[PDB]
Amino acid sequence: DDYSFSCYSQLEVNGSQHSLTCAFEDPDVNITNLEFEICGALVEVKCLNFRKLQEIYFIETKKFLLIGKSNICVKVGEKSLTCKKIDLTTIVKPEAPFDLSVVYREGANDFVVTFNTSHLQKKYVKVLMHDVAYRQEKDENKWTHVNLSSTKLTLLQRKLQPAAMYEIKVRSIPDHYFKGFWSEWSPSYYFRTPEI
Amino acid sequence: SVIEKLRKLEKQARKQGDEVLVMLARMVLEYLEKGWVSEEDADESADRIEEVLKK
């Protein structure tokens, strides 16, 4: 497909408003004459037009029914080039976690990793799986990934190298009725393990 | 019946303490009674709810 694209939704991203972001899978696609439209599984209206924003297509609206498939079409004026049936509840990209913090406790000989997510206060995409990734700063392609369903991870002092600089970051994916993609990574946090 | 499946799932989600699934099963029942969604889409949605409850 010459007009091959992919999308991600963000539910309750701005209060009760949801968002939908589409882009061509080939980044060199010339979008001069190309417009995007979504029809079906909408609340009061039949169709909605996307806003073209430099390289992506975006809609921010409350009018998503969130049950049933929507048809997203690429158009040249009124002619449809390609259409795709997408369920907006299966393409959710969570907002990134924030407020990442690592603390070392001498009494327990452990690192307590905590973070926050705005998804805990939402109605729909409340349940996520998180991915905490960490590495020794000096390394490239040597990240260790740990999954968790809460916002607190405990790492044992003996499972990390002593007297070393570590980098740690966290991301989330929907893990319940809603499916989708990994969020952006949170900013990195840097710490040093004790000398032992 | 799709409607009876959804009322069974809502009760199971209440018992399991899953407030998101209670809200979702009710939303699907409500939209189906109004003709806002098809029986096909309501049945696939009920199958997704049931799969999360099984976990």
Residue numbers in the entry:
A (entry chain A): 36 to 231
B (entry chain D): 1 to 55
Give me lines lifted from the publication on this model.
The design of proteins that bind to a specific site on the surface of a target protein using no information other than the three-dimensional structure of the target remains a challenge. Here we describe a general solution to this problem that starts with a broad exploration of the vast space of possible binding modes to a selected region of a protein surface, and then intensifies the search in the vicinity of the most promising binding modes. We demonstrate the broad applicability of this approach through the de novo design of binding proteins to 12 diverse protein targets with different shapes and surface properties. Biophysical characterization shows that the binders, which are all smaller than 65 amino acids, are hyperstable and, following experimental optimization, bind their targets with nanomolar to picomolar affinities.
We succeeded in solving crystal structures of five of the binder–target complexes, and all five closely match the corresponding computational design models. We anticipate that the binders created here, and new ones created with the method moving forwards, will find wide utility as signalling pathway antagonists as monomeric proteins and as tuneable agonists when rigidly scaffolded in multimeric formats, and in diagnostics and therapeutics for pathogenic disease.
